[PDB]
């Protein structure tokens, strides 16, 4: 009986080591491991015969639905096409933005002006909107 338990503990110890070298030593993008709320820093403390982990996590709430587009383009020049970086392009519902479209973060509802910092140039696609007036990235 003792030999069996010792082997299971050794395997469990390997799992703990992996979590120290993943869940604790770094933020992780994997989901799965760590507490289920994306991942943000986790901590570990001593427990009898083992380690006790605590995981801080992020829980989304109050979801709303919005209109969004796959990307935007220049209607005057089809090779000028953009798509958001780490976020989305949505129709604006905010009174401070004169532009019909706005950038948002993907973790939270937070519309903002579209600027070169939050977008990248991409190959053209048939689903991108054709913008015939005011786009600052590219200005032309």
């Amino acid at each position, epitope marked *: 009986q003792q030999l069996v338990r010792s082997e299971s503990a050794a395997l469990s110890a390997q799992l703990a080591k992996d979590k120290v070298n993943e869940c604790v030593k770094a933020q992780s993008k994997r989901s799965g491991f760590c507490g289920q709320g994306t991942h943000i820093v986790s901590f570990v403390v001593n427990a009898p015969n083992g380690l006790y982990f605590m995981h801080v996590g992020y829980y989304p709430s109050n979801h709303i639905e919005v*209109v969004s587009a796959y990307g935007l383009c220049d209607a005057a020049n089809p090779t000028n096409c953009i798509a958001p970086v780490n976020g989305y392009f949505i*129709k*604006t*519902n905010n*009174t*401070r*933005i*004169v*532009d*019909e479209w706005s950038y948002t973060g993907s973790s939270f509802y937070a519309p903002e*002006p579209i600027t070169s910092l939050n977008t990248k140039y991409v190959a053209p696609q048939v689903t991108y909107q054709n913008i015939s*007036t*005011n786009l600052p990235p590219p200005l032309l």
Partner: antibody
Amino acid sequence: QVQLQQSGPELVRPGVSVKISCKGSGYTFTDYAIHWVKQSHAKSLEWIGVFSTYYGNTNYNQKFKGRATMTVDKSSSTAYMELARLTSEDSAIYYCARKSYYVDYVDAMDYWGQGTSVT
Amino acid sequence: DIVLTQSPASLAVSLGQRATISCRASESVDNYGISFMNWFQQKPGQPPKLLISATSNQGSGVPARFIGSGSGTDFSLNIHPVEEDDTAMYFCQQSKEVPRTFGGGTKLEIK
């Protein structure tokens, strides 16, 4: 208790620029965009342009893109518009208006200024 | 922009009479079914004001007496109880695209 306080009327000479302003009241001024409208006749009105008061971003009616500009003075909670090269055909009742969303994704003109005029 | 027209150019009615306004667009104003149609009102000595929006026939300016209707290129405004203080100019507004132009309007007055 929202109000827009338009500046008083003036008989500006042709060939001279003219400036018009509205002071916001009863709300935080920086959370909205100002819309400007021209009333060329009692039977007709047209949009002039829009100015964000938070970012300073603008759009204009194409006919006024080389004729006018807009500025803000957030410490005074006011906004301005100025138009170059006035002519007698531009006499109008001018109105400021505040952006709103009574319906999702639909701009509404919401509150209106009492009207001012230039001739 | 999309051209807007309205009819009848003016209407005169008896007190408490039903009345309507027809408004046509040269091209549909729906984008993703949003519609973007706003109706406005004006009287002499005052600025024009919002009445209704295409998904709000009460509030957003006035009471449920002013019912907006239609989709695509056709819109209308229906008031079952027209009264003397409803004497006004009325205007269709397009919020769908810049320049954000709007119709020449119609006039309503009690006979």
